[PDB]
Amino acid sequence: IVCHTTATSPISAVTCPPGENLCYRKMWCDAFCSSRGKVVELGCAATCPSKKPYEEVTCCSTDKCNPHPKQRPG
Amino acid sequence: FRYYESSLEPWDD
Numbered sequence: 001i002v003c004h005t006t007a008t009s010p011i012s013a014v015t016c017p018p019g020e021n022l023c024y025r026k027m028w029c030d031a032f033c034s035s036r037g038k039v040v041e042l043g044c045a046a047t048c049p050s051k052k053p054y055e056e057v058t059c060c061s062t063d064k065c066n067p068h069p070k071q072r073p074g
Numbered sequence: 075f076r077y078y079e080s081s082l083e084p085w086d087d
Contacts, residue, residue, distance in 0.1 A: 006075060006077045006082075006084070009084035010084065030086055035080060036078045037078075038078070038079035039076045040076055041076045068079075070079055070081060070082065072081065
């Protein structure tokens, strides 16, 4: 499927490979949880693995189902 | 490089 990926400088959403049909969205109190925090690494995936205690990636089985918690251009 | 909850800039907003 397609899921927003922050891989690129800007923001966008492409169709994962023939190995991922899900969608994720990392998150962690970045080095600025004070103002920023929670780094969403929008992207795609075939599922949701273990994950870290601080750095966790969401999961979904639909396109644009793992958007940003602040989605917005510029 | 991510959309950091801060914004959507490739560098913590």
